[PDB]
């Protein structure tokens, strides 16, 4: 196979949906140890996000019904919900193992180092909602280790206004709030990230001027929603 060959195929599966093949295309790029450019990196992150995007939406509605069934139906609907989450666990196991075993070991550049770790935290956060007890604690803890480790490199080599660095700023802040129920602990953390970007707005460029503000509005909308 060829890298230029598969890039074209991905740019077609990016159309007409069928994200399952699109993810399978990017996976074959990894196994040869080839590094990904800035654009080659986006497709892998874009494709895998949507595949797990469907399951989470399906799970949330199904759980709502099961907690609203009060009785053989309640037995049946509960059985169906446990089936969906089993599919989710397969995807997260595949994706992070692909990073840990192949992509992360070859990571050299500073910006790419941030991106690999940020994906590690996010694709562990989704596993937390299924988990309960010490399983939830470990998943919360383990994802926090990667999240915390990722934040280290952010301050050393990245500007206060970097789209990838700000990307980790939003998710890691949410992780403490949504899952670990530490609102102000997360709110104080998220509040720091917002001021960094607005501090040196002049440093932006037309390539990412609005791109950075894409997260900034979300942070502001997160801030307003959390403040009340």
């Amino acid at each position: 196979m060829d890298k230029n060959e598969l890039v074209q195929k991905a740019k077609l599966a990016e159309q007409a949906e069928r994200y399952d093949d699109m993810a399978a295309c990017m996976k074959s790029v990894t196994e040869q140890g080839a590094e990904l450019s800035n654009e080659e990196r986006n497709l892998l992150s874009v494709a895998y996000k949507n595949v797990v995007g469907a399951r989470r939406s399906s799970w949330r509605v199904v759980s709502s019904i099961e907690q609203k069934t009060e009785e053989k139906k309640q037995q049946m609907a509960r059985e169906y919900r446990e089936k969906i989450e089993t599919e989710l666990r397969d995807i997260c196991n595949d994706v992070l193992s692909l990073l840990e075993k192949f992509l992360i070991p070859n990571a050299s550049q500073a910006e790419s180092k941030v991106f690999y770790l940020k994906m590690k935290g996010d694709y562990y956060r989704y596993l937390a909602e299924v988990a309960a007890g010490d399983d939830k604690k470990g998943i919360v803890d383990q994802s926090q280790q990667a999240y915390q480790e990722a934040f280290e490199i952010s301050k050393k080599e990245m500007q206060p206004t970097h789209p990838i660095r700000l990307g980790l700023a939003l998710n890691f802040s949410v992780f403490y709030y949504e899952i670990l129920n530490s609102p102000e602990k997360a709110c104080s953390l998220a509040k720091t990230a917002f001021d960094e970007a607005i501090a040196e707005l002049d440093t932006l460029s037309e390539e990412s001027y609005k791109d950075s503000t894409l997260i900034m509005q979300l942070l502001r909308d997160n801030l307003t929603l959390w403040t009340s």
Partner: protein, 290 residues
């Protein structure tokens, strides 16, 4: 604004061409959607091919006096409001004109012939009528309290899911009436009442002879009272609630979306809030432009 590819199922419509939308674009900002063919006219503001088949998922007259009438409940434009009881729980309106005119006398026969078939769920079911001493109309009594009383007298604020579902069931009412070629003038919460389980019942649709965009306009003010008990609406609620109200209150008639589209749209507005009820994540990069 950023846009992504999407295929729509059930029922969905364009926002510019305002016609059926099966496969088109959707905006993560303000939920804006449009066809590719109609994308040529879409601004930055917030070889056509045919379609096919979409999946879908005189004995009434009663004498006078026998009814054990109750206290006056209200005062209408063309009658007096009362509740009675005659072999069942009903309510009777005491109309104005003491001596019926010959024009409305025969029209009374046909008005009964028209109202005898309108049997919608979210409307107060017709039960009877009378004209023996004077014109009168019998309407089913609501086994509870009306809509206006609930939200203004002895305040009992409802669930937002219940609040929108009330509007959803309210939408089911007026839409069917327009399919009967009926245009309404007095559509307001002053004529809307709540039945068992506070289910919405709409009356004041009688007198087809004695007495749509304007109806939507009236319907727009009704839904305003729900979410208010424009910017005063809850921010935590889906932003598409504001968009639905904005279009329904346009001054131009045809610019206001018609009732058939709103029923599908209201279903959409009742899905985003439960599906996404949490702090927002991160949106990815846009991959479209014009």
């Amino acid at each position: 604004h950023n846009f992504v590819r999407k295929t729509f199922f059930t029922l969905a419509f364009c926002d510019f061409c305002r016609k059926l939308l099966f496969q088109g674009f959707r905006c993560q900002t303000c939920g804006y959607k449009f066809h590719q063919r109609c994308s040529t006219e879409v601004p930055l503001m917030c070889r056509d091919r045919s379609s096919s088949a979409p999946n879908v998922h005189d004995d009434w007259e009663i004498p006078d006096g026998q009814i054990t009438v109750g206290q006056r409940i209200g005062s209408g434009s063309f009658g007096t409001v009362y509740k009675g009881k005659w072999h069942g729980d009903v309510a009777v309106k005491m109309l104005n004109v003491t001596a019926p005119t010959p024009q409305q006398l025969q029209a009374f026969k046909n008005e009964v012939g028209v109202l005898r078939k309108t049997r919608h769920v979210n409307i107060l079911l017709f039960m009877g009528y009378s004209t023996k001493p004077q014109l009168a109309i019998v309407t089913q009594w609501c086994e509870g309290s009306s809509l206006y009383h609930h939200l203004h007298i002895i305040e009992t604020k409802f669930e937002m899911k219940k609040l929108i579902d009330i509007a959803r069931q309210t939408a089911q009412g007026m839409d069917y009436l327009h399919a009967k070629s009926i245009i309404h003038r007095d559509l307001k919460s002053n004529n809307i009442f709540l039945h068992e389980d506070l289910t919405v019942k709409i009356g004041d649709f009688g007198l087809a002879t004695v007495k749509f965009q304007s109806d939507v306009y009236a319907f727009g003010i009704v839904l305003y009272e729900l979410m208010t008990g424009l910017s005063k609406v809850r921010s935590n609620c889906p932003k598409a609630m504001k968009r639905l109200m904005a279009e329904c209150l346009k001054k131009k008639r045809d610019e206001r979306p018609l009732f058939p589209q709103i029923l599908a749209s209201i279903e959409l507005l009742a899905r985003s809030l439960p599906k996404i009820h949490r702090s927002a994540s991160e949106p990815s990069l846009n991959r479209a432009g014009f």
